[PDB]
Every structure is written in structure tokens, then in C-alpha cells.
Amino acid sequence: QLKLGNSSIVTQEAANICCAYGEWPTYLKPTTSTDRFYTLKSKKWESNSTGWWWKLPDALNQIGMFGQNVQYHYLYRSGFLCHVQCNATKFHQGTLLIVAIPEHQIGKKGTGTSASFAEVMKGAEGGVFEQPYLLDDGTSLACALVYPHQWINLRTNNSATIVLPWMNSAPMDFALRHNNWTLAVIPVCPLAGGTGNTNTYVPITISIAPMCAEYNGL
């Protein structure tokens, strides 16, 4: 039962919580009770789904005291603890690949113009892959394992944990229009809980905790 600040979340950790590139997040004039777990809206993992993605600073611009500080303060610097729970019975099957892409430049298909502020900055709602196979990046899903990756296998491994440090080429950056990380949950193998489709949902639960958070300018 994990708990940061006031909020708590019940976990099912059974293996070492791997830190992204083995660096535990830390903060180093700038600087405090907003370091708490935010559980995003549950997402339906249908058999015909493609894949979801949340931009963490974008995802937390409007959520509680963290959102209030980001709207008030001109800068930020924050690590992210991402907990993903695919909730299903022993009967269900499939594989979720959780990839924390650094600087995931969204790429439209068969257009000249780039993605606008609307298509990129979903916020708390999160986005959906048009082409999961190409990560909407020109890359391959086969090559997506270079990034901090984990597997939710509906057999054995029913939850994933990612610990993202401050990945940016500046000590601090802006949350309003920059996205250091992109947490992408992609179904590698389609959900096949063949119970006559009594409940095809098998919803995914995302929980983001901004750790070692500091800001500049009150």
C-alpha cells in the first residue's frame, strides 16, 4: 500500500521497481505537500484498441495543487513515479508494453503540416496512437525497448512501475508547453478474455506521482 504525502494507493509490487536509466529522481533560490499520487481516469482496453499515451507535465497541468503551482510558477523540475495497473481475472490474456519515451515528437501520417497544440496537448484525458506499430514517431514498436520499458503480462505480471528522473538538457524547464516524458501503454497482443464478451472492458488505471518537485517564481 504505497503512499506519498496525504493520498495512498494499494499496489501489487512483486519485483524491483526499476528506475529509468538507474537514476533515482532528485532536485538540484528555487525550492510542498503536492507530492501525492494522482490516479487518472480508467481506460477501456478493448480487443480492437491501438494504444494510449499521457504527456506527464501536460497530464498534471490541471490536477490539484501540482496544477495550481504549475499555473502560478513560471518554471518546474520534477521526477515522476508512474504506476500502471491492468485489472483482469485469471481467465483474460494479453500483454501491455509500458514505454516512457523521452521527447516523443508526435508525427501525423500522410500530411505535410505538423501536429497542432490540440492533437499533442490532450492533458489528463491522454492520447491514442493512430499507428501503434510506428509509435507516431517514424520509429518501430519493435525498436521501442531502448526507452525505459516494462511488461504487464496478464499471466504473472499484472502491474508495472516506472521511475523517471529529470530528463532535460536544462536544470529546469516549462510545464505549460514542454513534455519531457511520454508514458505510452500499448497492447502488443490483443485482449482475448473469451468469456462471451460478458465484460470486454478490462480497464487500465494510471497513477502519476511528481517526486522531488521544485519551482521558480511565486
Partner 1 sequence: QTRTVINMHGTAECLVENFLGRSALVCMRSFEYKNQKNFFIWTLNTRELVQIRRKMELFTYLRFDTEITIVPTLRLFLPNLTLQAMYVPTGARKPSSQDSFEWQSACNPSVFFKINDPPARLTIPFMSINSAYANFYDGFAGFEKKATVLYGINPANTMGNLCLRVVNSYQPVQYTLTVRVYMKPKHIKAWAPRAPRTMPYTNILNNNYAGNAPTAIVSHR
Partner 2 sequence: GVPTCLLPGSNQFLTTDDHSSAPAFPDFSPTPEMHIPGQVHSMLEIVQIESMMEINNVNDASGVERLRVQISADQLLFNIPLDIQLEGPLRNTLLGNISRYYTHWSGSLEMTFMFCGSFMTTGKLIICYTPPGGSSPTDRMQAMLATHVVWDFGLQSSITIIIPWISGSHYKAINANVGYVTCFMQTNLVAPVGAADQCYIVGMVAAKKDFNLRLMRDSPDI
Whose cell is 504487464? That residue is 152
Residue 178 binding partner per list partner 2, partner 1, none, with a CB distance cut-off of 5 to 8 Å that depends on partner kind: partner 1
C-alpha to C-alpha distance for 52 and 41, rounded to whole angstroms: 12
Cell numbers that stand for 121 in this block: 496537448
Closer residue to partner 1 in complex, CB, 56/63: 56
84 contributes a contact to partner 2 by CB under 8 A: no
Burial class (CB in 10 A: 0-12, 13-18, 19+), 217: exposed
The burial class, CB within 10 Å (0-12 / 13-18 / 19+), for 187 is buried
64 versus 190: smaller Cβ distance to partner 2: 190
Site string for partner 1, 25-54 (x = CB under 8 A): ------------------------------
Q: Which stretch binds partner 2 (CB under 8 A): 4-12, 34-42, 114-122, 159-167?
A: 159-167
Asked if residues 82 and 56 have their Cβ atoms less than 8 Å apart, the reply is yes
- The yes or no reply on residue 164 touching partner 1 (CB under 8 A) is no
Rounded Cα distance, 113 and 115, in Å:
7
Is the separation of the CB atoms in 37 and 209 below 8 Å?
A: yes
DSSP 199: -
d(CA 184, CA 168): 19
Among 5, 6, 21, 151, binds partner 1 (CB under 8 A): 21
6 part of the interface to partner 1, by CB under 8 A: no
Which of partner 2, partner 1, none does residue 18 bind (CB under 5 to 8 Å by kind)? none
Q: For 137, what's the count of Cα atoms within 13 Å in the CB-facing half-sphere?
A: 17
Q: Which residues of the shown chain bind partner 2 in the complex (CB under 8 A)? A: 20-21, 23, 72, 74, 89-95, 102, 131-133, 140-146, 151, 153-157, 165-169, 171, 186, 188-190, 192-195, 217-218
Q: Which residues of the shown chain bind partner 1 in the complex (CB under 8 A)? A: 21, 55, 75, 102-117, 120, 131, 133-135, 137-140, 142-144, 146-147, 167, 169-174, 176-180, 182
